[PDB]
Structures are given as C-alpha cells and as structure tokens.
C-alpha cells in the first residue's frame, strides 16, 4: 500500500529584550543652540558651530 504525504506543525514563541543608550548636554551650551535671542553676529560665531 502507498504512503501519504505527511507534514508537521511547529509553534514558536517571541522572546522580548530591549537595548538602551544615553548621552547628555551641558547647561552652558543649551541656550547657545535654540536660543533665538542672539540677533546679528553670534548666530554665525565660532563657538556656536
């Protein structure tokens, strides 16, 4: 007698992890970037760059 085409069934689980990294920024160089008070020359200074 013949044979039948067998097959199997597999169930797998998703194992969860997570990575993280961080940096900072100095309070002295905070307002130097976003601060829109600098009118005419500090907007193209060297320390801003």
């Amino acid at each position: 007698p013949a044979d039948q085409p067998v097959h199997n069934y597999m169930i797998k689980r998703l194992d969860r992890r997570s990575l993280n990294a961080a940096f900072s920024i100095a309070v002295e160089a905070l307002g130097l970037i976003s601060g829109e008070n600098l009118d005419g020359t500090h907007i193209s200074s060297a320390m801003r760059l």
């Binding site: 309070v27 307002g31 601060g35």
Partner: protein, 49 residues
Amino acid sequence: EKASESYFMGQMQVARTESGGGLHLQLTQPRANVDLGVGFTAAYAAAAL
C-alpha cells in the same frame, strides 16, 4: 571712578525640580568683572562712628 570696573552680564538660566509641596524654580545668572586702570580706583573713608 568714571569707569573703574568692567562688567559682563551672562544669560539667565532656569532649573526645575519636582517635589511634593509644588515646584522649585531656582533661577540663576552668571556674571564677570575685572579692573582696568593701573593703580587703585577706590578708597575708604571711616567717616563717622
């Protein structure tokens, strides 16, 4: 004197810190100075007693 001390005003800074009784809003500002003229530029006078 007519101009004894130089003087530079920095940029104001805020500093929030959460708490129970509300919120603390320590606000700071850094400043700098230097004298210029040779010799002294000020004096005492122990006037009264």
